[PDB]
Amino acid sequence: TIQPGTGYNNGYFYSYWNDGHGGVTYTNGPGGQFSVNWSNSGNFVGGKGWQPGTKNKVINFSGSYNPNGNSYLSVYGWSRNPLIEYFIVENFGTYNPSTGATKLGEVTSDGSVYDIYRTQRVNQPSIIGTATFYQYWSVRRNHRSSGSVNTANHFNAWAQQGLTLGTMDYQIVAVEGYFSSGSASITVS
Ligand SMILES: O[C@@H]1[C@@H](O)[C@H](O[C@@H]2CO[C@@H](O[C@@H]3CO[C@H](O)[C@H](O)[C@H]3O)[C@H](O)[C@H]2O)OC[C@H]1O
């Protein structure tokens, strides 16, 4: 179990962030593996990957993902200039994060159609401090907890729709939770 923060573990970048509410434990394992155990958490996001990411990375993930409540399993990252938080959502719990969001297209990648959306965060935490910024989403129709994500198909489809990314910051496979419980064990490569 570790301190919220960022760093390197067994050759992989990792980021673990939480809102301080309690109820979540995050552990880095061998190679690209990480685990999350949570019970009546607050908001948190953690996982392993790269710093910086790239715009054509093929990201592999495998393992188990057992949310009980509001949680996502995604390729997750940021761009700077413009500041964007992005999600390629492979699975989720009780809440589809695109609920109520305006659909901006579709993309077929890695065995499923994904629906594309843009949302906005207003005065929220970010990699550069409190800010207002857009979020980009690709939400997989066919849920899974292992697979391969060709990020270029998503970033290209987003750009085509007017959802442009700046310079890549970190890029991870992440478990996110919002006031929920669950367990997950995921290996990245
Ligand atoms: O000390 C600061 C870190 O705490 C900071 O971390 C980022 C803060 O913002 C998080 O994004 C939220 C996570 O949850 C959802 O998805 C929300 O929309 C986001 O607001 C990032 O995950 C953290 O990496 O980095 C800056 C550092 O100075």
PDB file of C-alpha atoms and ligand atoms in Angstrom:
ATOM      1  CA  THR A   1       0.000   0.000   0.000  1.00  0.00           C
ATOM      2  CA  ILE A   2       1.345   3.420  -0.869  1.00  0.00           C
ATOM      3  CA  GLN A   3       1.174   7.189  -0.472  1.00  0.00           C
ATOM      4  CA  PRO A   4      -0.974   9.121  -2.906  1.00  0.00           C
ATOM      5  CA  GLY A   5       1.499  10.524  -5.382  1.00  0.00           C
ATOM      6  CA  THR A   6       3.344   9.627  -8.537  1.00  0.00           C
ATOM      7  CA  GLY A   7       6.532   7.744  -9.289  1.00  0.00           C
ATOM      8  CA  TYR A   8       8.022   4.678 -10.893  1.00  0.00           C
ATOM      9  CA  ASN A   9       7.570   1.069  -9.899  1.00  0.00           C
ATOM     10  CA  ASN A  10       9.212  -1.905 -11.749  1.00  0.00           C
ATOM     11  CA  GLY A  11       9.719   0.243 -14.807  1.00  0.00           C
ATOM     12  CA  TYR A  12       6.210   1.725 -14.944  1.00  0.00           C
ATOM     13  CA  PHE A  13       4.992   5.164 -14.101  1.00  0.00           C
ATOM     14  CA  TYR A  14       2.160   5.224 -11.608  1.00  0.00           C
ATOM     15  CA  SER A  15      -0.269   7.808 -10.319  1.00  0.00           C
ATOM     16  CA  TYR A  16      -2.476   7.367  -7.261  1.00  0.00           C
ATOM     17  CA  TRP A  17      -4.754  10.242  -6.264  1.00  0.00           C
ATOM     18  CA  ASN A  18      -7.566  10.442  -3.761  1.00  0.00           C
ATOM     19  CA  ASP A  19      -9.752  13.128  -2.168  1.00  0.00           C
ATOM     20  CA  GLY A  20      -8.733  12.199   1.393  1.00  0.00           C
ATOM     21  CA  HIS A  21     -12.033  10.608   2.348  1.00  0.00           C
ATOM     22  CA  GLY A  22     -10.543   7.218   3.235  1.00  0.00           C
ATOM     23  CA  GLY A  23     -11.554   3.703   2.322  1.00  0.00           C
ATOM     24  CA  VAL A  24      -9.164   2.960  -0.509  1.00  0.00           C
ATOM     25  CA  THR A  25      -5.881   1.049  -0.606  1.00  0.00           C
ATOM     26  CA  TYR A  26      -3.653   1.033  -3.704  1.00  0.00           C
ATOM     27  CA  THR A  27      -0.739  -1.340  -4.169  1.00  0.00           C
ATOM     28  CA  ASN A  28       1.958  -1.605  -6.824  1.00  0.00           C
ATOM     29  CA  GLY A  29       2.972  -5.131  -7.757  1.00  0.00           C
ATOM     30  CA  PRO A  30       5.558  -6.836  -9.958  1.00  0.00           C
ATOM     31  CA  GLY A  31       6.040  -5.576 -13.492  1.00  0.00           C
ATOM     32  CA  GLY A  32       3.021  -3.675 -14.720  1.00  0.00           C
ATOM     33  CA  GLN A  33       0.686  -4.957 -12.000  1.00  0.00           C
ATOM     34  CA  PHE A  34      -1.301  -2.918  -9.505  1.00  0.00           C
ATOM     35  CA  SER A  35      -4.160  -3.677  -7.136  1.00  0.00           C
ATOM     36  CA  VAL A  36      -6.929  -1.573  -5.646  1.00  0.00           C
ATOM     37  CA  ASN A  37      -9.154  -2.517  -2.708  1.00  0.00           C
ATOM     38  CA  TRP A  38     -11.822  -0.074  -1.633  1.00  0.00           C
ATOM     39  CA  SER A  39     -14.752  -0.010   0.761  1.00  0.00           C
ATOM     40  CA  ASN A  40     -16.953   3.081   1.105  1.00  0.00           C
ATOM     41  CA  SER A  41     -14.306   5.240  -0.542  1.00  0.00           C
ATOM     42  CA  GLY A  42     -14.392   8.831  -1.643  1.00  0.00           C
ATOM     43  CA  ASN A  43     -13.143   9.838  -5.087  1.00  0.00           C
ATOM     44  CA  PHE A  44      -9.884   8.213  -6.212  1.00  0.00           C
ATOM     45  CA  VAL A  45      -7.969   7.270  -9.365  1.00  0.00           C
ATOM     46  CA  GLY A  46      -4.889   5.056  -9.582  1.00  0.00           C
ATOM     47  CA  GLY A  47      -2.945   2.909 -11.994  1.00  0.00           C
ATOM     48  CA  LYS A  48       0.194   2.222 -14.008  1.00  0.00           C
ATOM     49  CA  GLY A  49       1.520   3.317 -17.369  1.00  0.00           C
ATOM     50  CA  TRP A  50       3.730   6.018 -18.837  1.00  0.00           C
ATOM     51  CA  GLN A  51       4.926   9.563 -18.305  1.00  0.00           C
ATOM     52  CA  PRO A  52       4.604  11.065 -20.835  1.00  0.00           C
ATOM     53  CA  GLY A  53       2.124   9.086 -22.868  1.00  0.00           C
ATOM     54  CA  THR A  54       2.054   9.103 -26.647  1.00  0.00           C
ATOM     55  CA  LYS A  55      -0.624   9.556 -29.291  1.00  0.00           C
ATOM     56  CA  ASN A  56      -0.203   6.125 -30.885  1.00  0.00           C
ATOM     57  CA  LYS A  57       0.530   3.800 -27.975  1.00  0.00           C
ATOM     58  CA  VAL A  58      -0.996   0.306 -28.032  1.00  0.00           C
ATOM     59  CA  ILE A  59      -1.821  -0.402 -24.393  1.00  0.00           C
ATOM     60  CA  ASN A  60      -2.405  -3.907 -23.120  1.00  0.00           C
ATOM     61  CA  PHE A  61      -4.252  -4.704 -19.877  1.00  0.00           C
ATOM     62  CA  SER A  62      -5.372  -7.849 -18.144  1.00  0.00           C
ATOM     63  CA  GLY A  63      -6.833  -8.893 -14.849  1.00  0.00           C
ATOM     64  CA  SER A  64      -9.899  -8.662 -12.643  1.00  0.00           C
ATOM     65  CA  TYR A  65     -12.197  -5.728 -11.950  1.00  0.00           C
ATOM     66  CA  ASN A  66     -15.018  -6.072  -9.411  1.00  0.00           C
ATOM     67  CA  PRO A  67     -16.680  -2.754  -8.598  1.00  0.00           C
ATOM     68  CA  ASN A  68     -19.641  -2.487  -6.252  1.00  0.00           C
ATOM     69  CA  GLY A  69     -21.019   0.951  -7.098  1.00  0.00           C
ATOM     70  CA  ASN A  70     -19.644   3.866  -9.100  1.00  0.00           C
ATOM     71  CA  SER A  71     -16.257   3.030 -10.658  1.00  0.00           C
ATOM     72  CA  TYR A  72     -14.500   2.954 -14.039  1.00  0.00           C
ATOM     73  CA  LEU A  73     -11.694   0.936 -15.617  1.00  0.00           C
ATOM     74  CA  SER A  74     -10.087   2.997 -18.372  1.00  0.00           C
ATOM     75  CA  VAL A  75      -7.072   4.138 -20.238  1.00  0.00           C
ATOM     76  CA  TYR A  76      -6.750   7.466 -18.462  1.00  0.00           C
ATOM     77  CA  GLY A  77      -4.534  10.466 -18.950  1.00  0.00           C
ATOM     78  CA  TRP A  78      -4.085  14.163 -19.512  1.00  0.00           C
ATOM     79  CA  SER A  79      -2.878  16.591 -22.079  1.00  0.00           C
ATOM     80  CA  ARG A  80      -1.553  20.107 -21.399  1.00  0.00           C
ATOM     81  CA  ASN A  81      -2.122  23.200 -23.527  1.00  0.00           C
ATOM     82  CA  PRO A  82      -4.954  22.551 -23.791  1.00  0.00           C
ATOM     83  CA  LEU A  83      -5.554  20.904 -20.434  1.00  0.00           C
ATOM     84  CA  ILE A  84      -7.731  17.835 -21.096  1.00  0.00           C
ATOM     85  CA  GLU A  85      -8.573  14.820 -18.953  1.00  0.00           C
ATOM     86  CA  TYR A  86      -9.367  11.811 -21.125  1.00  0.00           C
ATOM     87  CA  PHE A  87     -10.845   8.374 -20.730  1.00  0.00           C
ATOM     88  CA  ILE A  88     -11.079   5.286 -22.917  1.00  0.00           C
ATOM     89  CA  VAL A  89     -13.528   3.390 -20.717  1.00  0.00           C
ATOM     90  CA  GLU A  90     -13.367  -0.399 -20.995  1.00  0.00           C
ATOM     91  CA  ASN A  91     -15.698  -1.235 -18.088  1.00  0.00           C
ATOM     92  CA  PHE A  92     -17.656   0.483 -15.325  1.00  0.00           C
ATOM     93  CA  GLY A  93     -19.908  -0.234 -12.359  1.00  0.00           C
ATOM     94  CA  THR A  94     -23.278   1.342 -11.587  1.00  0.00           C
ATOM     95  CA  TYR A  95     -22.731   4.480 -13.630  1.00  0.00           C
ATOM     96  CA  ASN A  96     -22.006   5.051 -17.292  1.00  0.00           C
ATOM     97  CA  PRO A  97     -19.885   8.242 -17.146  1.00  0.00           C
ATOM     98  CA  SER A  98     -21.479   9.531 -20.357  1.00  0.00           C
ATOM     99  CA  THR A  99     -24.966   9.645 -18.820  1.00  0.00           C
ATOM    100  CA  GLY A 100     -26.525  12.946 -19.833  1.00  0.00           C
ATOM    101  CA  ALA A 101     -23.530  13.924 -21.975  1.00  0.00           C
ATOM    102  CA  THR A 102     -23.866  14.906 -25.615  1.00  0.00           C
ATOM    103  CA  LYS A 103     -22.748  12.198 -28.026  1.00  0.00           C
ATOM    104  CA  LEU A 104     -20.115  13.443 -30.480  1.00  0.00           C
ATOM    105  CA  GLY A 105     -19.540  10.340 -32.588  1.00  0.00           C
ATOM    106  CA  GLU A 106     -18.569   6.688 -32.676  1.00  0.00           C
ATOM    107  CA  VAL A 107     -15.316   4.818 -33.205  1.00  0.00           C
ATOM    108  CA  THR A 108     -14.715   1.117 -33.773  1.00  0.00           C
ATOM    109  CA  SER A 109     -11.553  -0.224 -32.175  1.00  0.00           C
ATOM    110  CA  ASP A 110     -10.261  -3.454 -30.688  1.00  0.00           C
ATOM    111  CA  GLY A 111     -13.419  -5.494 -31.070  1.00  0.00           C
ATOM    112  CA  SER A 112     -16.113  -3.001 -30.076  1.00  0.00           C
ATOM    113  CA  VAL A 113     -17.839   0.201 -31.044  1.00  0.00           C
ATOM    114  CA  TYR A 114     -17.249   3.072 -28.620  1.00  0.00           C
ATOM    115  CA  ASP A 115     -19.412   6.155 -28.207  1.00  0.00           C
ATOM    116  CA  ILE A 116     -17.615   9.515 -27.949  1.00  0.00           C
ATOM    117  CA  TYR A 117     -18.539  12.363 -25.592  1.00  0.00           C
ATOM    118  CA  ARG A 118     -17.209  15.634 -24.225  1.00  0.00           C
ATOM    119  CA  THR A 119     -17.939  16.947 -20.716  1.00  0.00           C
ATOM    120  CA  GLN A 120     -16.560  19.826 -18.661  1.00  0.00           C
ATOM    121  CA  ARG A 121     -15.176  20.109 -15.143  1.00  0.00           C
ATOM    122  CA  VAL A 122     -15.525  23.513 -13.477  1.00  0.00           C
ATOM    123  CA  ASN A 123     -13.020  24.567 -10.793  1.00  0.00           C
ATOM    124  CA  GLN A 124     -11.839  21.025 -10.122  1.00  0.00           C
ATOM    125  CA  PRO A 125      -8.521  19.430  -9.259  1.00  0.00           C
ATOM    126  CA  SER A 126      -6.145  18.814 -12.145  1.00  0.00           C
ATOM    127  CA  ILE A 127      -2.478  18.226 -12.891  1.00  0.00           C
ATOM    128  CA  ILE A 128      -1.944  22.018 -12.933  1.00  0.00           C
ATOM    129  CA  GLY A 129      -4.142  23.038  -9.989  1.00  0.00           C
ATOM    130  CA  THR A 130      -7.783  23.973  -9.679  1.00  0.00           C
ATOM    131  CA  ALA A 131      -9.101  24.620 -13.169  1.00  0.00           C
ATOM    132  CA  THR A 132     -11.980  24.420 -15.609  1.00  0.00           C
ATOM    133  CA  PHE A 133     -11.244  21.946 -18.391  1.00  0.00           C
ATOM    134  CA  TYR A 134     -12.846  19.572 -20.853  1.00  0.00           C
ATOM    135  CA  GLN A 135     -12.924  15.793 -20.549  1.00  0.00           C
ATOM    136  CA  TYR A 136     -12.962  13.492 -23.574  1.00  0.00           C
ATOM    137  CA  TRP A 137     -14.592  10.061 -23.405  1.00  0.00           C
ATOM    138  CA  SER A 138     -14.681   6.922 -25.514  1.00  0.00           C
ATOM    139  CA  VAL A 139     -17.077   4.503 -23.795  1.00  0.00           C
ATOM    140  CA  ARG A 140     -16.814   0.851 -24.863  1.00  0.00           C
ATOM    141  CA  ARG A 141     -20.114  -0.871 -25.641  1.00  0.00           C
ATOM    142  CA  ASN A 142     -18.725  -4.384 -24.976  1.00  0.00           C
ATOM    143  CA  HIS A 143     -17.418  -4.317 -21.363  1.00  0.00           C
ATOM    144  CA  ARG A 144     -14.231  -6.212 -20.536  1.00  0.00           C
ATOM    145  CA  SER A 145     -11.332  -6.300 -18.072  1.00  0.00           C
ATOM    146  CA  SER A 146      -8.607  -7.559 -20.431  1.00  0.00           C
ATOM    147  CA  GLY A 147      -7.690  -6.461 -23.928  1.00  0.00           C
ATOM    148  CA  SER A 148      -5.683  -4.138 -26.086  1.00  0.00           C
ATOM    149  CA  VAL A 149      -6.378  -0.423 -26.716  1.00  0.00           C
ATOM    150  CA  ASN A 150      -5.021   1.180 -29.889  1.00  0.00           C
ATOM    151  CA  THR A 151      -5.047   4.727 -28.496  1.00  0.00           C
ATOM    152  CA  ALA A 152      -4.498   6.274 -31.940  1.00  0.00           C
ATOM    153  CA  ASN A 153      -7.948   5.160 -33.106  1.00  0.00           C
ATOM    154  CA  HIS A 154      -9.472   7.104 -30.233  1.00  0.00           C
ATOM    155  CA  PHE A 155      -7.275  10.183 -30.411  1.00  0.00           C
ATOM    156  CA  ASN A 156      -7.755  10.383 -34.185  1.00  0.00           C
ATOM    157  CA  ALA A 157     -11.538  10.005 -33.913  1.00  0.00           C
ATOM    158  CA  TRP A 158     -11.631  12.655 -31.185  1.00  0.00           C
ATOM    159  CA  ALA A 159      -9.583  15.050 -33.328  1.00  0.00           C
ATOM    160  CA  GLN A 160     -11.780  14.399 -36.314  1.00  0.00           C
ATOM    161  CA  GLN A 161     -14.788  15.495 -34.184  1.00  0.00           C
ATOM    162  CA  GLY A 162     -13.064  18.658 -32.926  1.00  0.00           C
ATOM    163  CA  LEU A 163     -11.798  17.199 -29.620  1.00  0.00           C
ATOM    164  CA  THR A 164      -8.149  18.127 -29.874  1.00  0.00           C
ATOM    165  CA  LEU A 165      -5.400  17.143 -27.466  1.00  0.00           C
ATOM    166  CA  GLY A 166      -2.353  19.135 -26.485  1.00  0.00           C
ATOM    167  CA  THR A 167       0.980  17.768 -25.319  1.00  0.00           C
ATOM    168  CA  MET A 168       0.615  14.438 -23.553  1.00  0.00           C
ATOM    169  CA  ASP A 169       1.146  14.256 -19.841  1.00  0.00           C
ATOM    170  CA  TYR A 170       0.756  10.869 -18.055  1.00  0.00           C
ATOM    171  CA  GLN A 171      -1.139   7.953 -19.587  1.00  0.00           C
ATOM    172  CA  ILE A 172      -2.135   4.973 -17.454  1.00  0.00           C
ATOM    173  CA  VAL A 173      -4.585   2.137 -17.099  1.00  0.00           C
ATOM    174  CA  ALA A 174      -6.562   3.305 -14.086  1.00  0.00           C
ATOM    175  CA  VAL A 175      -9.252   2.217 -11.694  1.00  0.00           C
ATOM    176  CA  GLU A 176     -11.379   5.154 -10.668  1.00  0.00           C
ATOM    177  CA  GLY A 177     -13.983   5.148  -7.911  1.00  0.00           C
ATOM    178  CA  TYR A 178     -16.493   7.674  -6.628  1.00  0.00           C
ATOM    179  CA  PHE A 179     -17.908   6.772  -3.201  1.00  0.00           C
ATOM    180  CA  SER A 180     -18.103   3.046  -3.838  1.00  0.00           C
ATOM    181  CA  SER A 181     -16.499  -0.289  -2.967  1.00  0.00           C
ATOM    182  CA  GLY A 182     -14.690  -2.917  -4.969  1.00  0.00           C
ATOM    183  CA  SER A 183     -11.528  -4.789  -5.772  1.00  0.00           C
ATOM    184  CA  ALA A 184      -9.288  -4.878  -8.829  1.00  0.00           C
ATOM    185  CA  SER A 185      -6.042  -6.499  -9.960  1.00  0.00           C
ATOM    186  CA  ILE A 186      -4.698  -5.209 -13.283  1.00  0.00           C
ATOM    187  CA  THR A 187      -1.476  -5.799 -15.227  1.00  0.00           C
ATOM    188  CA  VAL A 188      -0.383  -3.217 -17.822  1.00  0.00           C
ATOM    189  CA  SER A 189       2.095  -3.418 -20.718  1.00  0.00           C
TER     190      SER A 189
HETATM  191  O1  LIG B   1      -0.513  17.503  -5.698  1.00  0.00           O
HETATM  192  C1  LIG B   1      -1.176  17.578  -6.974  1.00  0.00           C
HETATM  193  C2  LIG B   1      -1.883  16.249  -7.292  1.00  0.00           C
HETATM  194  O2  LIG B   1      -2.882  16.038  -6.288  1.00  0.00           O
HETATM  195  C3  LIG B   1      -2.561  16.284  -8.677  1.00  0.00           C
HETATM  196  O3  LIG B   1      -3.137  15.300  -8.920  1.00  0.00           O
HETATM  197  C4  LIG B   1      -4.129  15.292  -9.910  1.00  0.00           C
HETATM  198  C5  LIG B   1      -5.399  15.926  -9.332  1.00  0.00           C
HETATM  199  O4  LIG B   1      -6.504  15.741 -10.228  1.00  0.00           O
HETATM  200  C6  LIG B   1      -6.849  14.384 -10.477  1.00  0.00           C
HETATM  201  O5  LIG B   1      -7.904  14.458 -11.318  1.00  0.00           O
HETATM  202  C7  LIG B   1      -9.210  14.250 -10.779  1.00  0.00           C
HETATM  203  C8  LIG B   1      -9.344  12.729 -10.683  1.00  0.00           C
HETATM  204  O6  LIG B   1     -10.673  12.253 -10.758  1.00  0.00           O
HETATM  205  C9  LIG B   1     -11.504  12.463 -11.826  1.00  0.00           C
HETATM  206  O7  LIG B   1     -11.412  11.891 -12.856  1.00  0.00           O
HETATM  207  C10 LIG B   1     -11.542  14.147 -11.833  1.00  0.00           C
HETATM  208  O8  LIG B   1     -12.238  14.721 -12.954  1.00  0.00           O
HETATM  209  C11 LIG B   1     -10.232  14.927 -11.705  1.00  0.00           C
HETATM  210  O9  LIG B   1     -10.464  16.265 -11.277  1.00  0.00           O
HETATM  211  C12 LIG B   1      -5.683  13.652 -11.149  1.00  0.00           C
HETATM  212  O10 LIG B   1      -6.017  12.300 -11.221  1.00  0.00           O
HETATM  213  C13 LIG B   1      -4.390  13.818 -10.305  1.00  0.00           C
HETATM  214  O11 LIG B   1      -3.282  13.265 -11.032  1.00  0.00           O
HETATM  215  O12 LIG B   1      -1.526  16.478  -9.689  1.00  0.00           O
HETATM  216  C14 LIG B   1      -0.941  17.945  -9.403  1.00  0.00           C
HETATM  217  C15 LIG B   1      -0.179  17.913  -8.077  1.00  0.00           C
HETATM  218  O13 LIG B   1       0.479  19.167  -7.829  1.00  0.00           O
END
